[PDB]
Design an enzyme around this catalytic site. Structure first.
Site, PDB file in Angstrom:
ATOM      1  N   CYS B 118     -10.026  21.244 -25.551  1.00  0.00           N
ATOM      2  CA  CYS B 118     -10.140  20.922 -24.136  1.00  0.00           C
ATOM      3  C   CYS B 118     -11.520  21.307 -23.617  1.00  0.00           C
ATOM      4  O   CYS B 118     -11.869  22.487 -23.586  1.00  0.00           O
ATOM      5  CB  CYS B 118      -9.060  21.642 -23.334  1.00  0.00           C
ATOM      6  SG  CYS B 118      -9.255  21.390 -21.597  1.00  0.00           S
ATOM      7  N   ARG B 121     -11.862  23.746 -19.901  1.00  0.00           N
ATOM      8  CA  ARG B 121     -11.324  25.104 -19.834  1.00  0.00           C
ATOM      9  C   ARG B 121     -12.156  26.087 -19.001  1.00  0.00           C
ATOM     10  O   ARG B 121     -11.787  27.267 -18.947  1.00  0.00           O
ATOM     11  CB  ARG B 121     -11.153  25.668 -21.244  1.00  0.00           C
ATOM     12  CG  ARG B 121     -10.081  24.991 -22.089  1.00  0.00           C
ATOM     13  CD  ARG B 121     -10.019  25.643 -23.474  1.00  0.00           C
ATOM     14  NE  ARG B 121     -11.009  25.094 -24.409  1.00  0.00           N
ATOM     15  CZ  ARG B 121     -11.458  25.716 -25.498  1.00  0.00           C
ATOM     16  NH1 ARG B 121     -11.023  26.942 -25.787  1.00  0.00           N
ATOM     17  NH2 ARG B 121     -12.337  25.109 -26.307  1.00  0.00           N
ATOM     18  N   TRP B 290      -7.666  16.898 -13.799  1.00  0.00           N
ATOM     19  CA  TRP B 290      -8.367  15.718 -13.328  1.00  0.00           C
ATOM     20  C   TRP B 290      -9.148  15.114 -14.502  1.00  0.00           C
ATOM     21  O   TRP B 290      -9.456  15.786 -15.489  1.00  0.00           O
ATOM     22  CB  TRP B 290      -9.276  16.053 -12.131  1.00  0.00           C
ATOM     23  CG  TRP B 290     -10.190  17.196 -12.385  1.00  0.00           C
ATOM     24  CD1 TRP B 290     -11.378  17.163 -13.073  1.00  0.00           C
ATOM     25  CD2 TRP B 290     -10.002  18.557 -11.976  1.00  0.00           C
ATOM     26  NE1 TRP B 290     -11.935  18.416 -13.119  1.00  0.00           N
ATOM     27  CE2 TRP B 290     -11.113  19.292 -12.455  1.00  0.00           C
ATOM     28  CE3 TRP B 290      -9.003  19.229 -11.253  1.00  0.00           C
ATOM     29  CZ2 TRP B 290     -11.253  20.657 -12.236  1.00  0.00           C
ATOM     30  CZ3 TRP B 290      -9.145  20.589 -11.033  1.00  0.00           C
ATOM     31  CH2 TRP B 290     -10.262  21.289 -11.522  1.00  0.00           C
ATOM     32  N   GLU B 295     -12.477   9.413 -20.206  1.00  0.00           N
ATOM     33  CA  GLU B 295     -11.096   9.350 -20.680  1.00  0.00           C
ATOM     34  C   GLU B 295     -10.366   8.119 -20.171  1.00  0.00           C
ATOM     35  O   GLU B 295      -9.382   7.696 -20.786  1.00  0.00           O
ATOM     36  CB  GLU B 295     -10.298  10.565 -20.238  1.00  0.00           C
ATOM     37  CG  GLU B 295     -10.692  11.905 -20.774  1.00  0.00           C
ATOM     38  CD  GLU B 295      -9.757  12.961 -20.183  1.00  0.00           C
ATOM     39  OE1 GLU B 295      -8.676  13.150 -20.759  1.00  0.00           O
ATOM     40  OE2 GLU B 295     -10.081  13.533 -19.124  1.00  0.00           O
TER      41      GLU B 295
HETATM   42  C1  HEM Z   1      -8.873  20.187 -15.065  1.00  0.00           C
HETATM   43  C2  HEM Z   1      -9.561  19.230 -15.688  1.00  0.00           C
HETATM   44  C3  HEM Z   1      -9.445  18.975 -17.211  1.00  0.00           C
HETATM   45  C4  HEM Z   1     -10.337  18.239 -17.885  1.00  0.00           C
HETATM   46  C5  HEM Z   1     -11.614  17.571 -17.305  1.00  0.00           C
HETATM   47  C6  HEM Z   1      -9.917  18.197 -19.265  1.00  0.00           C
HETATM   48  C7  HEM Z   1     -10.568  17.548 -20.287  1.00  0.00           C
HETATM   49  C8  HEM Z   1     -10.039  17.264 -21.529  1.00  0.00           C
HETATM   50  C9  HEM Z   1     -10.485  16.220 -22.431  1.00  0.00           C
HETATM   51  C10 HEM Z   1     -11.650  15.244 -22.128  1.00  0.00           C
HETATM   52  C11 HEM Z   1      -9.724  16.271 -23.536  1.00  0.00           C
HETATM   53  C12 HEM Z   1      -9.901  15.302 -24.733  1.00  0.00           C
HETATM   54  C13 HEM Z   1      -8.666  14.440 -24.938  1.00  0.00           C
HETATM   55  C14 HEM Z   1      -9.018  12.985 -25.099  1.00  0.00           C
HETATM   56  O1  HEM Z   1     -10.172  12.603 -24.827  1.00  0.00           O
HETATM   57  O2  HEM Z   1      -8.120  12.190 -25.479  1.00  0.00           O
HETATM   58  C15 HEM Z   1      -8.759  17.371 -23.369  1.00  0.00           C
HETATM   59  C16 HEM Z   1      -7.765  17.814 -24.230  1.00  0.00           C
HETATM   60  C17 HEM Z   1      -6.784  18.770 -23.958  1.00  0.00           C
HETATM   61  N1  HEM Z   1      -6.539  19.393 -22.732  1.00  0.00           N
HETATM   62 FE1  HEM Z   1      -7.877  19.512 -21.187  1.00  0.00          FE
HETATM   63  N2  HEM Z   1      -8.745  18.925 -19.389  1.00  0.00           N
HETATM   64  C18 HEM Z   1      -8.406  19.424 -18.140  1.00  0.00           C
HETATM   65  C19 HEM Z   1      -7.265  20.177 -17.861  1.00  0.00           C
HETATM   66  C20 HEM Z   1      -6.307  20.674 -18.738  1.00  0.00           C
HETATM   67  C21 HEM Z   1      -5.161  21.544 -18.428  1.00  0.00           C
HETATM   68  C22 HEM Z   1      -4.777  22.054 -17.021  1.00  0.00           C
HETATM   69  C23 HEM Z   1      -4.514  21.792 -19.572  1.00  0.00           C
HETATM   70  C24 HEM Z   1      -3.262  22.660 -19.836  1.00  0.00           C
HETATM   71  C25 HEM Z   1      -2.885  23.664 -19.046  1.00  0.00           C
HETATM   72  C26 HEM Z   1      -5.235  21.106 -20.625  1.00  0.00           C
HETATM   73  C27 HEM Z   1      -4.912  21.103 -21.951  1.00  0.00           C
HETATM   74  C28 HEM Z   1      -5.483  20.280 -22.897  1.00  0.00           C
HETATM   75  C29 HEM Z   1      -5.051  20.215 -24.265  1.00  0.00           C
HETATM   76  C30 HEM Z   1      -3.899  21.034 -24.890  1.00  0.00           C
HETATM   77  C31 HEM Z   1      -5.820  19.332 -24.896  1.00  0.00           C
HETATM   78  C32 HEM Z   1      -5.649  18.985 -26.379  1.00  0.00           C
HETATM   79  C33 HEM Z   1      -4.939  17.642 -26.375  1.00  0.00           C
HETATM   80  C34 HEM Z   1      -4.545  17.244 -27.766  1.00  0.00           C
HETATM   81  O3  HEM Z   1      -4.526  18.110 -28.697  1.00  0.00           O
HETATM   82  O4  HEM Z   1      -4.241  16.036 -27.918  1.00  0.00           O
HETATM   83  N3  HEM Z   1      -6.294  20.440 -20.083  1.00  0.00           N
HETATM   84  N4  HEM Z   1      -8.997  17.929 -22.131  1.00  0.00           N
HETATM   85  N1  LIG Z   2      -8.277  15.161 -17.844  1.00  0.00           N
HETATM   86  C1  LIG Z   2      -7.363  15.703 -18.688  1.00  0.00           C
HETATM   87  C2  LIG Z   2      -6.551  16.755 -18.263  1.00  0.00           C
HETATM   88  C3  LIG Z   2      -5.612  17.316 -19.117  1.00  0.00           C
HETATM   89  C4  LIG Z   2      -5.464  16.805 -20.384  1.00  0.00           C
HETATM   90  C5  LIG Z   2      -6.266  15.738 -20.784  1.00  0.00           C
HETATM   91  C6  LIG Z   2      -6.110  15.215 -22.204  1.00  0.00           C
HETATM   92  C7  LIG Z   2      -5.253  13.962 -22.288  1.00  0.00           C
HETATM   93  C8  LIG Z   2      -4.950  13.729 -23.764  1.00  0.00           C
HETATM   94  C9  LIG Z   2      -3.923  12.622 -23.980  1.00  0.00           C
HETATM   95  N2  LIG Z   2      -3.758  12.386 -25.427  1.00  0.00           N
HETATM   96  C10 LIG Z   2      -4.743  11.372 -25.859  1.00  0.00           C
HETATM   97  C11 LIG Z   2      -4.778  11.184 -27.367  1.00  0.00           C
HETATM   98  C12 LIG Z   2      -4.048  12.014 -28.214  1.00  0.00           C
HETATM   99  C13 LIG Z   2      -4.098  11.819 -29.591  1.00  0.00           C
HETATM  100  C14 LIG Z   2      -4.878  10.800 -30.126  1.00  0.00           C
HETATM  101  C15 LIG Z   2      -5.613   9.967 -29.289  1.00  0.00           C
HETATM  102  O1  LIG Z   2      -6.467   8.850 -29.858  1.00  0.00           O
HETATM  103  C16 LIG Z   2      -6.445   8.852 -31.386  1.00  0.00           C
HETATM  104  C17 LIG Z   2      -7.626   9.632 -31.940  1.00  0.00           C
HETATM  105  C18 LIG Z   2      -7.940   9.615 -33.304  1.00  0.00           C
HETATM  106  C19 LIG Z   2      -9.025  10.339 -33.806  1.00  0.00           C
HETATM  107  C20 LIG Z   2      -9.806  11.086 -32.935  1.00  0.00           C
HETATM  108  C21 LIG Z   2     -10.891  11.804 -33.400  1.00  0.00           C
HETATM  109  C22 LIG Z   2     -11.636  12.537 -32.478  1.00  0.00           C
HETATM  110  C23 LIG Z   2     -11.295  12.525 -31.125  1.00  0.00           C
HETATM  111  N3  LIG Z   2     -12.005  13.217 -30.211  1.00  0.00           N
HETATM  112  N4  LIG Z   2     -10.234  11.817 -30.702  1.00  0.00           N
HETATM  113  C24 LIG Z   2      -9.495  11.104 -31.573  1.00  0.00           C
HETATM  114  C25 LIG Z   2      -8.417  10.380 -31.081  1.00  0.00           C
HETATM  115  C26 LIG Z   2      -5.561  10.163 -27.913  1.00  0.00           C
HETATM  116  N5  LIG Z   2      -7.187  15.216 -19.929  1.00  0.00           N
END
Ligand code: HEM
Ligand SMILES: Nc1cccc(CCCCNCc2cccc(OCc3ccc4ccc(N)nc4c3)c2)n1
Ligand code: HEM
Ligand SMILES: Nc1cccc(CCCCNCc2cccc(OCc3ccc4ccc(N)nc4c3)c2)n1
Ligand SMILES: [Zn+2]
Lengths: 413, 420
Positions: B118, B121, B290, B295
């Site tokens: 994330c 954070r 947010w 994204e």
């Molecule tokens: C407040 C603004 C936040 C922003 C801008 C943000 C940003 C991001 C971004 C850009 C990703 C990459 C995921 C993707 O691109 O598909 C991510 C992953 C993640 N976020 Fe944050 N996030 C926020 C808040 C939070 C909050 C409040 C939580 C939990 C309490 C959280 C938990 C996670 C987790 C667990 C992941 C890993 C997702 C996974 O393993 O698929 N995020 N975040």
């Molecule tokens: N504002 C915020 C606030 C809180 C949380 C978030 C995160 C939203 C995450 C939603 N779950 C999206 C996701 C999950 C798993 C796979 C996805 O796509 C496939 C893929 C495959 C390879 C990757 C390699 C690198 C990389 N960075 N991503 C990959 C994604 C999407 N956002």
């Protein structure tokens, strides 16, 4: 044991067995990943023979001759050299096979679909820096091929006791000089300021222009390195113009056509080739013309964004993103116009996926460093971004090695 | 080894990491292989598949309570020793234990703090926790989630929040949000093979239709909620539209852009993850913050049945789409991302561009090394999906390691659910 990698875009699953044959550390432990660490971390007789046995075994495997009378005699012949001289010498076939497979094994390289077509220049008879200059000039002329670029490597004599090393002190064969100015500004390439100062100190007389091709700094047999000027007629260059912005040419930019890494170490069967310059052609995004300075304050990025009338106040205008695309368009269009080989990051990643799948089929895997395979821009709209990849170190390999001015003990008083 | 340095190759700043020495579970890597780009590299759980014996659950419980009382500079105190005995008796008599409200809030925030993927954070300690462990039905879940959405959206001034439903008991009575996110657009498979709506959500959309949902089969159809309580069959619910804040995407210079009729929703709210604290497993824990502008996957969105919004935007831009080396995807991608930020800002809906967000994360990393001794981070996920090398995180080295409490992945419920 069999590991799977998935492609989250296509759903394709490949099964990796090759990883069973890796041997040296990734740097990662069972509880920490070092995937984004750049560098994470002289052989005796007893270390050398198992390594020689390894390489010879695999070479004879590769030519469907494992266990053959020729295989066993080679192994015995290697054992005798190591027992007698604490080292051994590769046959020409083994040197070619090994250099080709070091490139095949280079997990950070997206251009490996071409690995089997590497031109190997055996320079193990070279004894002097002048000879290195001769060998390297022939490399450049051959690789450049009047713009129809061809992969080649030139392999100088291997390490012996570590005190008679051959080294190309340049990081690439063709790079542009960098000068820091009294007022803090930079002229030329900021990436090369330190190596430029070394050259000036060695006696090189810098033209103090903006695209000064650096001199070669060559070291043979552990002696002090020597300066040589590559003949300008051998340095193919591309003036950078944009297909839509007629003003782009007025930035005055050019780049060199031939990328040629010269500071890495080639390891084959436990032998270390401390000088092994190799060259291919560019992927468009590698060309760092972005980091030049047009005036006394602005980058080529900032200058391109300026001339585009971009709102360079807030980041969220994405002016930096916008100008970055245009510079890359210009680089690609310029090379293509001048019929100099280049590959865009879309074309290269697609071919890498085809290569990766074919490597899984015939070889049982393909080690790949996703952190390095993904291009530096537009990452997720290229196919490698969603491709899972396993990283492991196969040998033969290319390895980083210390910069020679940090370890060289200077001969002449 | 003893301490692991990380280096920023632009600034030459070196941070020294000791927090990794408190890492509990495997990354998937070995000395010999790196799985840094595998989506789910390991299955190293902390407890067996379901209801565990005391010697399996209590050591996990002890470690968390220890860390919590250490966090507030007690440890060995009356409250701490009394709490261990309370957890002990509670497992003895119910095979589980119940977190205090202080304990629940600490663990939620530290599962966010520990989310190595994330980039957001910097804000981890500013998280609103909504305790929903008294919930017993899907209607109750629907009410709890509705209030989450209203609080978090806050008329555009988005606020981070998490709603935590009852922990898993035996694995048969799970609470689950079947949606991956609270608000998402439907994906319809057209009889000719092309997709209408959002192709990322085709399967779930078909699961809803199969459950009795009537698709409007319009363009941006908000998916209903599919809510599972106490292991029963899940139930469909329609979020009230007035609670789903949406931003029409226009472009600051291209006036044709709004004529694409595109819009995205304002509130990203992950709802299919599992939160793990002291051995307890909260299988329904929707959290929201947010968006980072990158994204918003509006580019893959298919209004037509021939063209992505990406290739559509390229047509309106009159881009040479003959071959790749024109970089038309690159150019259209920047414009779409310019349009998204512009609209969210114009409508006063919180959003962050990828430059500010990555800059913030470097600040966060420094703080975390200064106070905590390190910060776990997944480079493959922190680096934004466009313009990577011009953001500060590209040239920052990172150490990835698994700290607890954490958010874990979990099977989609329909794979493992037997219907009543
Ligand atoms: C407040 C603004 C936040 C922003 C801008 C943000 C940003 C991001 C971004 C850009 C990703 C990459 C995921 C993707 O691109 O598909 C991510 C992953 C993640 N976020 Fe944050 N996030 C926020 C808040 C939070 C909050 C409040 C939580 C939990 C309490 C959280 C938990 C996670 C987790 C667990 C992941 C890993 C997702 C996974 O393993 O698929 N995020 N975040
Ligand atoms: N504002 C915020 C606030 C809180 C949380 C978030 C995160 C939203 C995450 C939603 N779950 C999206 C996701 C999950 C798993 C796979 C996805 O796509 C496939 C893929 C495959 C390879 C990757 C390699 C690198 C990389 N960075 N991503 C990959 C994604 C999407 N956002
Ligand atoms: C023929 C066309 C080639 C292309 C298009 C290509 C492309 C690339 C790119 C884009 C990188 C990443 C470097 C960066 O992003 O700064 C790389 C790395 C690398 N390539 Fe290739 N390459 C080519 C040929 C070769 C050849 C011929 C060899 C060896 C004989 C080779 C060995 C390597 C190595 C060792 C690395 C890792 C460099 C490092 O770790 O610093 N490549 N390549
Ligand atoms: N056509 C061709 C043909 C042959 C060979 C090549 C490859 C040239 C490679 C030159 N030596 C690359 C290098 C070395 C050291 C530092 C560098 O920059 C810093 C940096 C920092 C973090 C990174 C994280 C991920 C990533 N992917 N790169 C990073 C680069 C570059 N090309
Ligand atoms: Zn790793």
């Amino acid at each position: 044991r069999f590991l799977k990698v998935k492609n989250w875009e296509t759903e394709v699953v490949l099964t990796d067995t090759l990883h069973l044959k890796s041997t040296l550390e990734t740097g990662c432990t069972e509880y920490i990943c070092m995937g984004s660490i750049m560098h994470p971390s002289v052989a005796t007789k007893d270390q050398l023979f198992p390594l020689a046995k390894e390489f010879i075994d695999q070479y004879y495997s590769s030519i469907k001759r494992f266990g053959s009378k020729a295989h066993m005699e080679r192994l015995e012949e290697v054992n005798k050299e190591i027992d007698t001289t604490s080292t051994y010498q590769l046959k020409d076939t083994e040197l070619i096979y090994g250099a080709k497979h070091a490139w095949r094994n280079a997990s950070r390289c997206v251009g490996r679909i071409q690995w089997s077509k590497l031109q190997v220049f055996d320079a193990r008879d070279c004894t002097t820096a002048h000879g290195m200059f001769n060998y390297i000039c022939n490399h450049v002329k051959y690789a450049t091929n009047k713009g129809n670029l061809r992969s080649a490597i030139t392999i100088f004599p291997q390490r012996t006791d570590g005190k008679h090393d051959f080294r190309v002190w340049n990081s690439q064969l063709i790079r542009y000089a960098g000068y820091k100015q009294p007022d803090g500004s930079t002229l030329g390439d900021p990436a090369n300021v330190q190596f430029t100062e070394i050259c000036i100190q060695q006696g090189w007389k810098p033209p103090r222009g903006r695209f000064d091709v650096l001199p070669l700094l060559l070291q043979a047999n552990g002696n002090d390195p020597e300066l040589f000027q590559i003949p300008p007629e051998l340095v193919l260059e591309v003036p950078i113009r944009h297909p839509k912005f007629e003003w782009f040419k007025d930035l005055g930019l050019k780049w060199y056509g031939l990328p040629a890494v010269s500071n890495m170490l080639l390891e084959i069967g436990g032998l270390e080739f401390s000088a092994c310059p190799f060259s291919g052609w560019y992927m468009g995004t590698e060309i760092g013309v972005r980091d030049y300075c047009d005036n006394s304050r602005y980058n080529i990025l900032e200058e391109v964004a300026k001339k585009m009338n971009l709102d360079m106040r807030k980041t969220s205008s994405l002016w930096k993103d916008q100008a970055l695309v245009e510079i890359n368009i210009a680089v690609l269009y310029s090379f293509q116009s001048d019929k100099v080989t280049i590959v865009d990051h879309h074309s290269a990643t697609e071919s890498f996926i085809k290569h990766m799948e074919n490597e899984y089929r015939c070889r049982g895997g393909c080690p790949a460093d996703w952190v390095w395979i993904v291009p530096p821009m537009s990452g997720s709209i290229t196919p490698v971004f969603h491709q899972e990849m396993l990283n492991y170190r196969l040998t033969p390999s290319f390895e980083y090695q210390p910069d020679p001015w940090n370890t060289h003990v200077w001969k002449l008083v």
